[PDB]
Design a protein around this ligand. Structure first.
Ligand code: FAD
Ligand code: DLZ
Ligand code: SF4
Length: 507
């Protein structure tokens, strides 16, 4: 039937992979929805729908290109016990002589494929041909258990790939990082000017029925249509919409949050993370499209916006991938601060009196997405200050977000947010009181708590929790604000924090 069998996973939808540059009738391509891939974490139903639709679209595109593709849905993959069983049975059925696959982007899948063994079949693993940094270079660029600085890696990447560089090898604009100009709050004139996010109309009724018929666990909600891009064409449309609509304001409101506007869930962000992680788009092409848009705008897009966007993909994404692949098997076990508190229940329903937490959790449950500052300084900050269990936080983050693959979820969550790796990524806890939220958002205007109150009834819980965290880990000018208080005020704040922790289920 077939001599070579190649496997395509759900996040390896690269239309430009070297595999498909060759048109061969002795090669059979395999894409399959997998119970085991739905069982290692409780995915968002939006994420499951998006991945299934994207896999079907990729299979259809490859078949239209002439390649032999066998797409197996849950109704056809249930007969096999797991992915190795599926691979072995299909290879034996087609009498294949060789099996090949692209290197997975999670440690569990990578180890599973590495330990896969087939009788009389040569096993091969090839690069996904997606990431800017080659996989083999990770050991040198990221020593194990080494607190690699993201700024130096980002500068090296900028020099290596020639992005935002002068003719004499210097950063464009006179400085490497423009984040200081990218910390503005959304005001009423800005809120009125918020653009309509680009949404797609992808029916998901059949996919949802298939998921429910197989009793696949899931979280979140979907209607009859999915707004997320499910193919390369829709991903390119989203990229163009970002470039011509949101890019002139992406940096300016990178850290902004709001509870007023109906489009508060998107703001000026790209929302291209799923397309990049599913590999429908490449980081190189996204970066170059944004740079070309910035150069064409003739000043309408300032250097800070394009630099802040290019940092997130060139430096942060590649750096997180490198740190993950250099430290993973032991990185998963790191609990530096000894956090063991169970995750509060409202993380699954959004029923909390804290406005920031309610907005972030409800947005994640309804859209399967939250922009970066939410994940870092609302949910991440709450989990860090409340000493929530890193395992449960990782499960929530890896499941509820459509763009969540462990290679990027684990460092950002365990290290950057929870400081559970000792600072190998963040180098400092991203701990904040309610003052940061009040400065960057309008949540405190709609909150039942008072952000100007630090202790007592109706005070913002973050104010007491942050100070309790800082005093608990004081041995590492911040504490000046603590040393400038009366002892009675300090004890009132600490007792308020303890009471809030005791009633954490009623916040
Ligand atoms: C606790 C925590 C968990 C996170 N988990 C994930 C995750 O599972 N998957 C994921 O893709 N991102 C994750 N991030 C990074 C960031 O939240 C998302 O990349 C972003 O919110 C996706 O929305 P966007 O495409 O509009 O991003 P934009 O604001 O439009 O940023 C542009 C692009 O930059 C990249 N990027 C930005 N920040 C990061 C980052 N910290 N690490 C890697 N790439 C980055 C993404 O590809 C993103 O599409 C996490 C961040 C935190 C603080
Ligand atoms: C929800 C989901 N479903 C599937 C699936 O049905 N089949 C598949 O091959 N992959 C799926 N994935 C992606 C993987 O679970 C995983 O995150 C990546 O393959 C890691 O590279 C995900 C995330
Ligand atoms: S007052 Fe405190 S709890 Fe309420 S929205 Fe502001 S930071 Fe969040």
């Amino acid at each position: 039937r077939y001599s070579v069998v190649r496997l395509i996973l759900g996040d390896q939808l690269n239309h430009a992979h070297s595999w498909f540059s060759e048109h061969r009738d002795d090669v059979l391509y395999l894409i399959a929805e997998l119970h085991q891939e739905q069982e290692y974490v409780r995915h968002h139903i939006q994420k499951q729908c998006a991945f299934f639709a994207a896999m079907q679209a990729f299979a259809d595109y490859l078949s239209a290109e002439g390649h032999h593709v066998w797409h197996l849905d849950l109704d056809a993959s249930a007969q096999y016990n797991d992915l190795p069983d599926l691979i072995a049975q299909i290879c034996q059925q087609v009498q294949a002589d060789a099996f090949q696959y692209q290197r997975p982007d999670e440690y569990r899948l990578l180890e599973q494929m590495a330990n896969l063994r087939l009788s009389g079949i040569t096993i091969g693993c090839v690069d996904t041909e997606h990431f800017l940094l080659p996989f083999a270079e990770i050991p040198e660029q990221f020593p194990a258990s080494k607190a690699v600085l993201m700024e130096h890696f980002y500068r090296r990447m900028r020099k290596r790939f020639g992005y935002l560089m002068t003719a004499d090898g210097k950063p464009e604009g006179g400085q490497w990082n423009f984040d200081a100009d990218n910390r503005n709050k959304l005001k009423s004139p800005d809120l009125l000017q918020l653009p309509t996010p680009l949404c797609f109309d992808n029916p998901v009724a059949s996919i949802k029925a298939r998921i429910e018929r197989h009793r696949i666990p899931s979280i979140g909600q979907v209607g009859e249509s999915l707004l997320w891009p499910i193919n390369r064409a829709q991903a390119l449309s989203l990229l163009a919409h970002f470039c011509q609509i949101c890019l002139p304001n992406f940096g300016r409101f990178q850290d902004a949050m709001t509870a007023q506007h109906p489009h508060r869930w998107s703001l000026y962000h790209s929302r291209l993370s799923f397309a990049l992680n599913s590999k429908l788009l490449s980081p190189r092409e996204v970066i170059e499209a944004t740079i070309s848009a910035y150069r064409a705008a003739q000043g309408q897009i300032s250097l800070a916006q394009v630099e802040g966007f290019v940092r997130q993909i060139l430096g942060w994404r590649e750096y997180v991938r490198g740190m993950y692949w250099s430290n993973m098997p032991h990185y998963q076990t790191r609990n530096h601060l000894g956090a063991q508190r169970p995750l509060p229940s409202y993380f699954w329903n959004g029923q909390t009196k804290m406005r920031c937490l309610q907005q972030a959790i409800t947005q994640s449950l309804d859209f399967g997405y939250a922009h970066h500052i939410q994940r870092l300084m609302v949910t991440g900050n709450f989990a860090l200050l409340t000493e929530c269990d890193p395992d449960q936080v990782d499960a929530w983050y890896l499941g509820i977000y459509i763009d969540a693959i462990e290679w990027v979820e684990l460092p950002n969550t365990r290290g950057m947010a929870l400081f559970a790796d000792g600072g190998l990524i963040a180098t400092k806890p991203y701990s904040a009181s309610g003052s940061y939220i009040n400065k960057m958002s309008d949540y405190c205007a709609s909150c039942a708590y008072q952000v100007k109150l630090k202790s007592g009834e109706k005070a913002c819980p973050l104010n007491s929790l942050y100070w309790r965290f800082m005093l608990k880990h004081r041995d590492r000018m911040l504490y000046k604000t603590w040393d400038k208080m009366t002892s009675d005020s300090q004890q009132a704040i600490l007792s308020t924090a303890d009471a809030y922790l005791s009633q954490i289920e009623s916040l």
